[PDB]
Design a protein around this ligand. Structure first.
Ligand code: TYF
Ligand code: FE
Ligand code: FE
Lengths: 368, 367
């Protein structure tokens, strides 16, 4: 008596593969990358600083599976020849951090040819941010504006980077989707999907309007939020315009990651949102009992994990507190169940039907 | 044969001890949460949006009597609510844009800050912030020290506007700040300047740099200053810091082996890294110059943890240095434990490590 029909026109104007990395623009990349490495459990993989000859910026790379988190901070200007990332600008980086604080600068995706995906994007309305530049005849990097001061980066770690050698792993394996807030969803949705050809990923159905753009294989998901009390309007005010709201980090085992990330919340890691009331986890039997066992439900309660369902699969998720000083960007840890055939992207939705379940649990909790 | 140390006790105002150190950051949350894990300091007070402050976010880390403050500016679009009246968004942004992560204020507790500020300015000090009484309880004044670092005065002893943080806690053994060392291009002018308005006397000592230690009457507030074989790290400091600034802080510890076992264990998982260890010959000779102080097992612990041991006419100093704290090879941290001079412990017991360069060079050529 219910069926959800999802369509996929596969209208990608250029060949998009997978997410490549995320580049946080910092004021001091060392302390940001070392805190992220201890909280998320990511390994110090590569570096491009003074110890590698880079006299322009200190970029450090953290990895946990297919996830790459880059942390870039500008050196004192006292010619960016030794710079490994040619799109980096000292004036831009200082202005970005003074206007937005700690946050994501680049959302990088791997493409077949960055030079073509750049020209096709601009030919379809994309604002150019960095022209196609070939790195040592091996890698090509191009950047166009996504929203606000965040850029969409095309890659087809990097030259100039040196590997770091000499266990830090909590279960995070890849980046699922990067969500950004904009003042008006409409113009931002037609703009981004207007130069990538990304189709809308429908969700099965609070102060927000969300729409999910996705590539053909739907592994590159880009939800965008708009404020309708609203958490988004507070984000726009504190971030001084449109920016990335949160990053969803796929975990091989969300229970492993959550126990690893909660032991360290008070000793350098990350803090989480208030856990759902107990009646929320007394209602999981009549919701995902056929997916999660009774003991795995006890794990979600002890770890404060949100569990939502969809037409295809089940989504286990939780959110952290803001990563920096500003109540702006935070991190989402998810684990998707089902759609195995390789797992389909967006399996289980994103959590649209979770505000209704939290409202129902809070109204239930009370009165008891 | 005999070393003679003199103390004129010429403090132009009553000074007690170090109060706190305020780092100016780009993001105070990630820097403090990194410092809290590497050094083992407790989240004690906060002055951010959760307290009503829409101007900046200040977080205090404590370890015994040591207090590290971490201040980062909010966006001016939030528009009075600042608990630290000397804070300026443009100054904090321009400071960090010029020097990066570093020390802004070296706060010392005095008897009266309205006097410490006026007497200082009347004796050559460059004023940074006039005396401001906070909620009729705390008075804060600031005068320039060297570079963009300010010497902050705290009168009646975290601060009004801060909320205590509750919630076993972290503690690696660090208990107090020993001395705050700064690098300047010319030691001479900066010496007659700082001592010109403080009256701090020169602390006598028992490389590429020249050092001079200014100290208060009881010699608990120590402020060594450095000036620029191979090229000295002082000149490399001035280039990457864009002028004079604080070089390092010496964090005294009840047990340097406890603190180092905690700090080295976490160097690769978010903590702080240390300088390369001395060769084994340095610790084979560590029982001929310091054997009446350290036992055989305690000498073995220094070799395992890479600690340097120096000695002077009064006491013995066990010390070790960390790698630079941020992206720039500028600010770093020293862990110190002093033995001897017990009569309460005298300030500067064992010196500051001026003789370690000679014993290290003697140890490298022995290996
Ligand atoms: O990225 C997104 O749009 C979703 O992650 C948002 C979301 C997810 C779960 C939830 O309970 C509320 C909002
Ligand atoms: Fe999400
Ligand atoms: Fe020292």
């Amino acid at each position: 008596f219910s069926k959800f029909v999802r369509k996929n026109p596969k209208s990608d104007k250029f060949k998009v593969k997978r997410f490549h990395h995320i580049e946080f623009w910092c004021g001091d990349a060392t302390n940001v990358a070392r805190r992220f490495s201890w909280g998320l459990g990511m390994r110090f993989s590569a570096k491009s600083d003074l110890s590698t000859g880079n006299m322009v910026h200190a970029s450090y790379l953290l990895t946990s599976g297919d996830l790459r988190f880059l942390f870039t901070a500008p050196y004192s200007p006292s010619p960016t020849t030794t710079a490994s990332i040619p799109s980096f600008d000292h004036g831009s980086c200082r202005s970005f951090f003074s206007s937005h604080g700690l946050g994501v600068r680049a959302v990088a995706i791997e493409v077949e040819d960055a030079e073509s995906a750049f020209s096709i994007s601009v030919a379809n309305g994309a604002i150019p941010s960095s022209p196609p530049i070939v790195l040592n005849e091996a890698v090509t990097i191009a950047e166009v504006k996504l929203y606000g001061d965040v850029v969409l980066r095309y890659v087809s770690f990097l030259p100039g980077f040196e590997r770091v050698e000499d266990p830090l792993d909590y279960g995070i394996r890849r980046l699922d989707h990067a969500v950004g807030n904009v003042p008006e969803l409409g113009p931002a949705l037609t703009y981004v999907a207007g130069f990538t050809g990304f189709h809308q990923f429908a969700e099965f159905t609070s102060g927000l309007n969300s729409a999910v753009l996705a590539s053909n294989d739907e592994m590159v998901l880009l939800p965008i939020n708009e404020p309708v009390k609203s958490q988004i309007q507070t984000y726009l005010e504190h971030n001084e315009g449109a920016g990335l709201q949160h990053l969803a980090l796929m975990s091989e085992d969300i229970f492993r990651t959550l126990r690893e990330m909660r032991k360290r919340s008070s000793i350098g890691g990350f803090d989480f949102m208030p856990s759902p009331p107990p009646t929320y986890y007394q209602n999981l039997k009549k919701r995902v009992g056929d997916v999660l066992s009774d003991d795995q439900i006890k794990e979600c309660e002890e770890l404060g994990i949100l569990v939502d369902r969809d037409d295809q699969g089940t989504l286990l998720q939780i959110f952290t507190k803001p990563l920096g000083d500003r109540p702006t960007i935070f991190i989402e840890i998810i684990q998707r169940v089902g759609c195995m055939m390789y797992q389909s992207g967006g399996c289980g939705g994103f959590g649209k039907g979770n505000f209704s379940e939290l409202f129902k649990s809070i109204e239930e909790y009370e009165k008891t």
